[PDB]
Amino acid sequence: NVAHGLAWSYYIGYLRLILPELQARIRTYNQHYNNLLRGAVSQRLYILLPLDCGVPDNLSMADPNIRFLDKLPQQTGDRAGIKDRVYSNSIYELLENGQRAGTCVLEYATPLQTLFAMSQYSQAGFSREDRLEQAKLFCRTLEDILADASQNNCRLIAYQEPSLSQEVLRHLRQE
Amino acid sequence: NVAHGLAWSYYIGYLRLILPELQARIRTYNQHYNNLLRGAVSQRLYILLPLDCGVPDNLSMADPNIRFLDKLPQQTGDRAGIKDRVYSNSIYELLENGQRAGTCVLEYATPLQTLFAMSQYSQAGFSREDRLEQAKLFCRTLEDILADASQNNCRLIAYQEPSLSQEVLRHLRQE
Numbered sequence: 001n002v003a004h005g006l007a008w009s010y011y012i013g014y015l016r017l018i019l020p021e022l023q024a025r026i027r028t029y030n031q032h033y034n035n036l037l038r039g040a041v042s043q044r045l046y047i048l049l050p051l052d053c054g055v056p057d058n059l060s061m062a063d064p065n066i067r068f069l070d071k072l073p074q075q076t077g078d079r080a081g082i083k084d085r086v087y088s089n090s091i092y093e094l095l096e097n098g099q100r101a102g103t104c105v106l107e108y109a110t111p112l113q114t115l116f117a118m119s120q121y122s123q124a125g126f127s128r129e130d131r132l133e134q135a136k137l138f139c140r141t142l143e144d145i146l147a148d149a150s151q152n153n154c155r156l157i158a159y160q161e162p163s164l165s166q167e168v169l170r171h172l173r174q175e
Numbered sequence: 176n177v178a179h180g181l182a183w184s185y186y187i188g189y190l191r192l193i194l195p196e197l198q199a200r201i202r203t204y205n206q207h208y209n210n211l212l213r214g215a216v217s218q219r220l221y222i223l224l225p226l227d228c229g230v231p232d233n234l235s236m237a238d239p240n241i242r243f244l245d246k247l248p249q250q251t252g253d254r255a256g257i258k259d260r261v262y263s264n265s266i267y268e269l270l271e272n273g274q275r276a277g278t279c280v281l282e283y284a285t286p287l288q289t290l291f292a293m294s295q296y297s298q299a300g301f302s303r304e305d306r307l308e309q310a311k312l313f314c315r316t317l318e319d320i321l322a323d324a325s326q327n328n329c330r331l332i333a334y335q336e337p338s339l340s341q342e343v344l345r346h347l348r349q350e
């Protein structure tokens with residue numbers, strides 16, 4: 001349904017174009033930019049997928065143990081008539097007991113914001129109960145696309161709320 | 176169907192966020208940046224909608240009478256966890272008889288590229304004959320959204336090929 005189009009839009013528009021050349025940007029930050037004494041940013045992009053489609057624009061305000069650190073070197077590309085459309089990513093540190101536990105490239109999945117707004121607009125004909133299924137369908141289709149296509153550059157983090165920093169840390173430790 | 180989700184994604188993700196503050200950027204270029212002797216960039220964003228979903232990334236190569244001139248001051252905003260996600264636009268001149276006939280902010284509609292790629296991917300389950308209807312449906316839904324919501328900042332340019340520069344000029348002269 002709606003999520004299926006959004007999922008393919010996510011892969012074709014964003015993931016297919018920045019994942020193949022994301023590792024080099026992380027290398028460039030770690031070697032040439034990252035502080036000489038602060039470890040290394042992980043090699044994988046971690047994507048948050050709140051199934052309730054609550055996607056705040058500020059990750060740091062969504063968890064005090066998460067806070068912005070730096071940005072990777074931005075990726076530019078001529079896209080659909082725009083000269084040097086800029087694809088940017090933000091590096092975040094994760095705090096356990098007040099000490100930096102992990103640093104990675106972390107962001108939410110924007111199409112989930114699109115689903116949430118459509119449920120809020122009268123003309124979209126989208127319901128709140130419809131949204132929760134589309135949120136799940138969006139992740140499934142995204143998983144199917146990434147299964148058979150770059151690889152090992154993207155880890156999906158889905159969660160439903162009855163610590164987000166502990167949730168993300170939990171994924172970093174597994175690899 | 177698929178286009179309906181893409182159309183609302185286009186409005187919620189891009190148009191709702193740059194159209195309200197596009198006029199000021201055009202003012203800033205025209206006054207502080209644009210060459211003292213080259214006229215004024217038009218106040219409206221013109222969006223190309225090729226119904227065949229052929230969207231080249233280089234506008235200039237799609238018509239020799241169209242060629243890149245400059246970029247507007249980029250718009251930045253914290254979006255879905257990304258700090259200072261950059262929304263950029265490119266200014267183009269239109270050539271009639273080899274003399275500059277018009278200058279405006281021109282770009283293609285990216286979701287049409289997404290539709291085209293889905294028709295090319297086996298897992299998307301999207302057909303070429305399906306695409307042509309979805310391309311038309313995408314424009315209709317986009318027209319419906321813009322009808323009852325900013326306003327007079329965006330002109331849609333749809334066309335089917337049996338001069339793109341003459342086609343765009345035709346729209347500038349009407350206002």
Ligand SMILES: Nc1ncnc2c1ncn2[C@@H]1O[C@@H]2COP(=O)(O)O[C@@H]3[C@H](F)[C@@H](COP(=O)(O)O[C@H]2[C@H]1F)C[C@H]3n1cnc2c(=O)[nH]cnc21
Binds near residue numbers: 010011014088285
């Ligand atoms: N700056 C801009 N210039 C020109 N057009 C733009 C811009 N911004 C948005 N649009 C248009 O608006 C819709 C909705 O996009 P939204 O933001 O909802 O998310 C999009 C979609 F899910 C899909 C892109 O597919 P596309 O067909 O391009 O659709 C877009 C496009 F038509 C992936 C995702 N995505 C794209 N880029 C980034 C990024 O840098 N970070 C994080 N996610 C990103």
